[PDB]
PDB file of C-alpha atoms and ligand atoms in Angstrom:
ATOM      1  CA  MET A   1       0.000   0.000   0.000  1.00 47.38           C
ATOM      2  CA  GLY A   2       1.231   3.527  -0.983  1.00 45.94           C
ATOM      3  CA  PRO A   3       1.594   6.177   1.728  1.00 45.77           C
ATOM      4  CA  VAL A   4      -1.229   6.599   4.308  1.00 46.47           C
ATOM      5  CA  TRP A   5      -1.708   8.995   7.227  1.00 46.02           C
ATOM      6  CA  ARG A   6      -0.359   7.177  10.329  1.00 46.26           C
ATOM      7  CA  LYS A   7      -3.258   8.751  12.375  1.00 43.27           C
ATOM      8  CA  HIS A   8      -7.090   8.823  11.975  1.00 45.50           C
ATOM      9  CA  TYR A   9      -7.452  12.492  12.983  1.00 48.06           C
ATOM     10  CA  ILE A  10      -6.521  14.711  10.010  1.00 48.41           C
ATOM     11  CA  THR A  11      -6.577  18.524   9.784  1.00 48.33           C
ATOM     12  CA  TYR A  12      -7.145  20.713   6.761  1.00 48.72           C
ATOM     13  CA  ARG A  13      -6.941  24.453   6.068  1.00 47.61           C
ATOM     14  CA  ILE A  14      -8.156  26.464   3.117  1.00 42.80           C
ATOM     15  CA  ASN A  15      -5.104  28.632   2.046  1.00 40.93           C
ATOM     16  CA  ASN A  16      -7.115  30.841  -0.307  1.00 41.70           C
ATOM     17  CA  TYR A  17     -10.503  31.111  -2.054  1.00 41.57           C
ATOM     18  CA  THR A  18     -11.367  31.126  -5.756  1.00 43.10           C
ATOM     19  CA  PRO A  19     -13.161  34.359  -6.801  1.00 42.69           C
ATOM     20  CA  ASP A  20     -15.391  32.138  -8.971  1.00 44.07           C
ATOM     21  CA  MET A  21     -17.545  31.286  -5.958  1.00 45.95           C
ATOM     22  CA  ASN A  22     -19.033  32.710  -2.807  1.00 44.27           C
ATOM     23  CA  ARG A  23     -16.609  32.034   0.091  1.00 43.98           C
ATOM     24  CA  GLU A  24     -19.249  30.132   2.157  1.00 44.55           C
ATOM     25  CA  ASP A  25     -19.945  27.869  -0.931  1.00 44.58           C
ATOM     26  CA  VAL A  26     -16.207  26.972  -1.032  1.00 46.39           C
ATOM     27  CA  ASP A  27     -16.239  26.100   2.705  1.00 44.95           C
ATOM     28  CA  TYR A  28     -19.416  23.962   2.273  1.00 46.38           C
ATOM     29  CA  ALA A  29     -18.104  22.179  -0.888  1.00 47.85           C
ATOM     30  CA  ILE A  30     -14.811  21.267   0.838  1.00 48.43           C
ATOM     31  CA  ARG A  31     -16.483  20.285   4.142  1.00 48.17           C
ATOM     32  CA  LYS A  32     -18.920  17.956   2.300  1.00 46.22           C
ATOM     33  CA  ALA A  33     -16.100  16.432   0.195  1.00 50.80           C
ATOM     34  CA  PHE A  34     -14.215  15.469   3.428  1.00 52.61           C
ATOM     35  CA  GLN A  35     -17.523  14.144   4.892  1.00 53.17           C
ATOM     36  CA  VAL A  36     -17.976  11.794   1.836  1.00 54.74           C
ATOM     37  CA  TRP A  37     -14.695  10.036   2.889  1.00 51.63           C
ATOM     38  CA  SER A  38     -15.446  10.437   6.643  1.00 52.21           C
ATOM     39  CA  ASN A  39     -18.690   8.490   6.125  1.00 52.53           C
ATOM     40  CA  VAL A  40     -16.893   5.252   4.939  1.00 51.89           C
ATOM     41  CA  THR A  41     -13.718   5.281   7.088  1.00 50.19           C
ATOM     42  CA  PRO A  42     -12.622   5.803  10.723  1.00 50.52           C
ATOM     43  CA  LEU A  43     -11.069   9.151   9.636  1.00 49.84           C
ATOM     44  CA  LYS A  44     -12.034  12.411  11.337  1.00 52.34           C
ATOM     45  CA  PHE A  45     -11.313  15.757   9.566  1.00 50.72           C
ATOM     46  CA  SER A  46     -10.859  19.032  11.604  1.00 51.44           C
ATOM     47  CA  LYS A  47     -10.825  22.380   9.781  1.00 53.71           C
ATOM     48  CA  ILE A  48      -8.221  24.839  11.100  1.00 50.35           C
ATOM     49  CA  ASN A  49      -8.516  28.570  10.351  1.00 49.03           C
ATOM     50  CA  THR A  50      -4.883  29.401  11.134  1.00 51.04           C
ATOM     51  CA  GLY A  51      -1.677  27.356  11.656  1.00 51.20           C
ATOM     52  CA  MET A  52      -0.376  23.925  10.674  1.00 50.99           C
ATOM     53  CA  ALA A  53      -2.711  21.552   8.835  1.00 49.29           C
ATOM     54  CA  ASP A  54      -2.090  18.154   7.212  1.00 49.59           C
ATOM     55  CA  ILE A  55      -4.133  18.991   4.082  1.00 50.14           C
ATOM     56  CA  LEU A  56      -3.736  22.501   2.641  1.00 46.79           C
ATOM     57  CA  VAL A  57      -6.370  23.426  -0.003  1.00 47.62           C
ATOM     58  CA  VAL A  58      -4.950  25.926  -2.590  1.00 44.46           C
ATOM     59  CA  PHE A  59      -6.376  27.574  -5.675  1.00 43.81           C
ATOM     60  CA  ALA A  60      -3.486  28.594  -7.976  1.00 41.92           C
ATOM     61  CA  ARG A  61      -2.620  28.859 -11.671  1.00 42.14           C
ATOM     62  CA  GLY A  62       0.204  27.830 -14.009  1.00 40.05           C
ATOM     63  CA  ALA A  63       3.507  27.166 -12.218  1.00 42.40           C
ATOM     64  CA  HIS A  64       2.549  27.464  -8.498  1.00 43.46           C
ATOM     65  CA  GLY A  65       5.662  26.274  -6.607  1.00 43.37           C
ATOM     66  CA  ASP A  66       5.530  22.421  -6.794  1.00 42.71           C
ATOM     67  CA  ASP A  67       7.014  20.575  -9.691  1.00 44.89           C
ATOM     68  CA  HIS A  68       3.560  20.244 -11.338  1.00 44.94           C
ATOM     69  CA  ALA A  69       2.483  23.375 -13.234  1.00 44.91           C
ATOM     70  CA  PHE A  70      -1.187  23.719 -14.175  1.00 42.49           C
ATOM     71  CA  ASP A  71      -2.045  24.102 -17.841  1.00 40.70           C
ATOM     72  CA  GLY A  72      -4.636  26.913 -18.233  1.00 38.56           C
ATOM     73  CA  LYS A  73      -8.411  26.511 -18.767  1.00 40.34           C
ATOM     74  CA  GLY A  74      -9.343  22.792 -19.253  1.00 40.93           C
ATOM     75  CA  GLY A  75      -6.962  19.840 -19.371  1.00 41.18           C
ATOM     76  CA  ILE A  76      -5.841  19.249 -15.736  1.00 44.51           C
ATOM     77  CA  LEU A  77      -8.410  20.663 -13.280  1.00 42.44           C
ATOM     78  CA  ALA A  78      -6.661  19.848  -9.946  1.00 41.06           C
ATOM     79  CA  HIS A  79      -4.131  17.512  -8.222  1.00 38.23           C
ATOM     80  CA  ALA A  80      -3.182  16.397  -4.899  1.00 37.34           C
ATOM     81  CA  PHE A  81      -0.178  14.873  -3.098  1.00 39.60           C
ATOM     82  CA  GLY A  82      -0.410  11.558  -1.227  1.00 41.97           C
ATOM     83  CA  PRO A  83       0.015  11.502   2.543  1.00 41.80           C
ATOM     84  CA  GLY A  84       3.277  12.947   3.929  1.00 39.34           C
ATOM     85  CA  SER A  85       4.678  16.046   5.655  1.00 37.48           C
ATOM     86  CA  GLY A  86       4.857  19.500   4.007  1.00 40.97           C
ATOM     87  CA  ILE A  87       3.248  19.413   0.566  1.00 39.64           C
ATOM     88  CA  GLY A  88       2.163  15.806   1.381  1.00 38.89           C
ATOM     89  CA  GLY A  89      -1.650  15.634   1.351  1.00 41.93           C
ATOM     90  CA  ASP A  90      -2.137  19.102  -0.142  1.00 41.24           C
ATOM     91  CA  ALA A  91      -4.844  19.546  -2.804  1.00 38.88           C
ATOM     92  CA  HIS A  92      -4.479  22.191  -5.486  1.00 36.90           C
ATOM     93  CA  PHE A  93      -7.299  23.454  -7.771  1.00 36.55           C
ATOM     94  CA  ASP A  94      -6.425  25.129 -11.111  1.00 37.24           C
ATOM     95  CA  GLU A  95      -7.833  28.708 -10.785  1.00 36.19           C
ATOM     96  CA  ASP A  96      -7.904  28.838 -14.677  1.00 35.19           C
ATOM     97  CA  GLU A  97     -11.024  26.625 -14.268  1.00 35.08           C
ATOM     98  CA  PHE A  98     -14.454  28.179 -13.439  1.00 36.64           C
ATOM     99  CA  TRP A  99     -15.351  26.542 -10.081  1.00 34.74           C
ATOM    100  CA  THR A 100     -19.128  26.162  -9.338  1.00 35.76           C
ATOM    101  CA  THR A 101     -21.704  24.701  -6.904  1.00 38.17           C
ATOM    102  CA  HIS A 102     -23.546  23.186  -9.923  1.00 36.17           C
ATOM    103  CA  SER A 103     -23.333  21.448 -13.364  1.00 37.65           C
ATOM    104  CA  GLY A 104     -21.727  24.455 -15.142  1.00 35.21           C
ATOM    105  CA  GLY A 105     -17.967  25.110 -15.212  1.00 34.31           C
ATOM    106  CA  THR A 106     -16.211  22.600 -12.923  1.00 37.68           C
ATOM    107  CA  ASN A 107     -18.120  21.437  -9.809  1.00 33.25           C
ATOM    108  CA  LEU A 108     -15.730  22.064  -6.843  1.00 34.57           C
ATOM    109  CA  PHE A 109     -17.420  19.506  -4.511  1.00 35.35           C
ATOM    110  CA  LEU A 110     -17.045  16.608  -7.005  1.00 35.21           C
ATOM    111  CA  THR A 111     -13.448  17.628  -7.895  1.00 37.97           C
ATOM    112  CA  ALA A 112     -12.564  17.925  -4.188  1.00 40.89           C
ATOM    113  CA  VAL A 113     -13.977  14.431  -3.519  1.00 41.30           C
ATOM    114  CA  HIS A 114     -11.488  13.057  -6.125  1.00 41.62           C
ATOM    115  CA  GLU A 115      -8.536  15.176  -4.911  1.00 38.96           C
ATOM    116  CA  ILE A 116      -9.056  14.304  -1.229  1.00 37.86           C
ATOM    117  CA  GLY A 117      -9.106  10.667  -2.311  1.00 36.98           C
ATOM    118  CA  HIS A 118      -5.512  11.349  -3.538  1.00 35.92           C
ATOM    119  CA  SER A 119      -4.761  13.322  -0.314  1.00 34.76           C
ATOM    120  CA  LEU A 120      -5.727  10.093   1.657  1.00 36.70           C
ATOM    121  CA  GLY A 121      -3.543   7.833  -0.514  1.00 38.99           C
ATOM    122  CA  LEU A 122      -5.855   6.550  -3.368  1.00 36.11           C
ATOM    123  CA  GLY A 123      -4.772   6.243  -7.015  1.00 33.80           C
ATOM    124  CA  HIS A 124      -7.332   6.193 -10.093  1.00 30.44           C
ATOM    125  CA  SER A 125      -9.736   3.664 -10.676  1.00 30.83           C
ATOM    126  CA  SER A 126     -10.472   1.874 -13.987  1.00 29.76           C
ATOM    127  CA  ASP A 127     -14.202   1.852 -12.944  1.00 31.25           C
ATOM    128  CA  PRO A 128     -15.938   4.777 -14.731  1.00 26.17           C
ATOM    129  CA  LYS A 129     -18.549   4.943 -11.913  1.00 27.59           C
ATOM    130  CA  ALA A 130     -15.740   5.558  -9.324  1.00 28.51           C
ATOM    131  CA  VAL A 131     -15.057   9.160  -8.188  1.00 28.35           C
ATOM    132  CA  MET A 132     -11.330   8.147  -8.505  1.00 26.18           C
ATOM    133  CA  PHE A 133     -11.813   7.548 -12.293  1.00 26.28           C
ATOM    134  CA  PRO A 134      -9.272   9.940 -13.945  1.00 27.63           C
ATOM    135  CA  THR A 135     -11.801  12.243 -15.738  1.00 24.51           C
ATOM    136  CA  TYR A 136     -14.303  14.798 -14.401  1.00 21.93           C
ATOM    137  CA  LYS A 137     -17.993  13.837 -14.848  1.00 20.14           C
ATOM    138  CA  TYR A 138     -20.801  16.061 -13.441  1.00 19.96           C
ATOM    139  CA  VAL A 139     -23.317  13.909 -11.462  1.00 23.49           C
ATOM    140  CA  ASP A 140     -26.241  15.324  -9.482  1.00 22.32           C
ATOM    141  CA  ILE A 141     -24.582  16.287  -6.108  1.00 24.33           C
ATOM    142  CA  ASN A 142     -27.879  15.463  -4.305  1.00 26.85           C
ATOM    143  CA  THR A 143     -27.672  11.862  -5.682  1.00 30.95           C
ATOM    144  CA  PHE A 144     -23.813  11.584  -5.383  1.00 32.94           C
ATOM    145  CA  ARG A 145     -22.330   8.357  -3.973  1.00 31.26           C
ATOM    146  CA  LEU A 146     -18.863   6.791  -3.836  1.00 26.17           C
ATOM    147  CA  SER A 147     -18.855   3.648  -5.977  1.00 27.94           C
ATOM    148  CA  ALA A 148     -18.181   0.202  -4.405  1.00 29.74           C
ATOM    149  CA  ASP A 149     -14.600   0.412  -5.799  1.00 32.42           C
ATOM    150  CA  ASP A 150     -13.899   3.818  -4.105  1.00 30.59           C
ATOM    151  CA  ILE A 151     -15.131   2.320  -0.802  1.00 29.17           C
ATOM    152  CA  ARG A 152     -13.004  -0.875  -1.231  1.00 30.45           C
ATOM    153  CA  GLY A 153      -9.976   1.349  -2.032  1.00 28.96           C
ATOM    154  CA  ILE A 154     -10.250   3.678   0.946  1.00 29.33           C
ATOM    155  CA  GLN A 155     -11.177   0.877   3.400  1.00 31.11           C
ATOM    156  CA  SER A 156      -8.044  -1.136   2.234  1.00 30.76           C
ATOM    157  CA  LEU A 157      -6.001   1.919   3.457  1.00 31.65           C
ATOM    158  CA  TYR A 158      -7.928   2.794   6.701  1.00 33.89           C
ATOM    159  CA  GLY A 159      -9.747   0.689   9.379  1.00 32.19           C
TER     160      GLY A 159
HETATM  161  O1  K0Q B 201      -7.940  17.046 -13.681  1.00 31.29           O
HETATM  162  C1  K0Q B 201      -8.341  15.931 -14.011  1.00 31.29           C
HETATM  163  C2  K0Q B 201      -8.067  15.157 -15.397  1.00 31.29           C
HETATM  164  N1  K0Q B 201      -8.624  15.751 -16.579  1.00 31.29           N
HETATM  165  C3  K0Q B 201      -7.656  16.031 -17.652  1.00 31.29           C
HETATM  166  C4  K0Q B 201      -8.066  16.604 -18.867  1.00 31.29           C
HETATM  167  C5  K0Q B 201      -9.436  16.875 -19.040  1.00 31.29           C
HETATM  168  C6  K0Q B 201     -10.351  16.589 -17.995  1.00 31.29           C
HETATM  169  O2  K0Q B 201     -11.669  16.830 -18.156  1.00 31.29           O
HETATM  170  C7  K0Q B 201      -9.970  15.995 -16.758  1.00 31.29           C
HETATM  171  O3  K0Q B 201     -10.836  15.668 -15.919  1.00 31.29           O
HETATM  172  N2  K0Q B 201      -8.715  15.092 -13.029  1.00 31.29           N
HETATM  173  C8  K0Q B 201      -8.966  15.477 -11.637  1.00 31.29           C
HETATM  174  C9  K0Q B 201     -10.425  15.823 -11.493  1.00 31.29           C
HETATM  175  C10 K0Q B 201     -11.374  14.548 -11.535  1.00 31.29           C
HETATM  176  C11 K0Q B 201     -10.981  13.334 -11.885  1.00 31.29           C
HETATM  177  N3  K0Q B 201     -12.006  12.471 -11.729  1.00 31.29           N
HETATM  178  C12 K0Q B 201     -13.087  13.124 -11.308  1.00 31.29           C
HETATM  179  C13 K0Q B 201     -14.362  12.648 -11.063  1.00 31.29           C
HETATM  180  C14 K0Q B 201     -15.373  13.502 -10.602  1.00 31.29           C
HETATM  181  C15 K0Q B 201     -14.949  14.827 -10.418  1.00 31.29           C
HETATM  182  C16 K0Q B 201     -13.619  15.274 -10.695  1.00 31.29           C
HETATM  183  C17 K0Q B 201     -12.682  14.427 -11.138  1.00 31.29           C
HETATM  184 CA1   CA B 202       0.459  18.823   3.863  1.00 25.81          CA
HETATM  185 CA1   CA B 203      -6.306  23.367 -16.308  1.00 27.83          CA
HETATM  186 CA1   CA B 204     -11.286  30.537 -11.836  1.00 29.61          CA
HETATM  187 ZN1   ZN B 205       0.186  21.946  -7.283  1.00 28.88          ZN
HETATM  188 ZN1   ZN B 206      -6.629  12.245  -9.994  1.00 28.61          ZN
END
């Protein structure tokens, strides 16, 4: 198994906020994306407003200080680093995308579910129903569920 957090209590902090969205919608989207993974694991996520967090959430564009430059509108929407110190765990969202609460532009909640999967140690799935499938697909966020493969993958890492 690839890297995993060696603790079940994991902190996050939002570094900065996309102008594309209301601030409170960003907080809600991120909180609900952590909750999707909380619901199927023993992991507990604590938001910190200031100071050291395991998972830093960043919106940035182009070359943004890691060795993994973003590519402008479309192509790569986001990435995340597997568990570890420093940049380990951190999830980055390409600000050249138009982040939304809905089916237009790029739905932040769905993208954050995928990226936090990476932040917890998952790779891609070959199952197109899996949130960890490599490509973005809008699905009704009211009806959203992790596939059986996403649950198998995260439970093989934690519990
Ligand atoms: O950034 C990407 C990969 N990607 C590359 C070129 C064109 C794309 O449309 C695209 O999704 N993947 C991370 C976001 C993602 C990957 N799988 C998902 C499933 C649901 C929601 C979001 C995602
Ligand atoms: Ca980190
Ligand atoms: Ca991009
Ligand atoms: Ca944007
Ligand atoms: Zn990055
Ligand atoms: Zn991915």
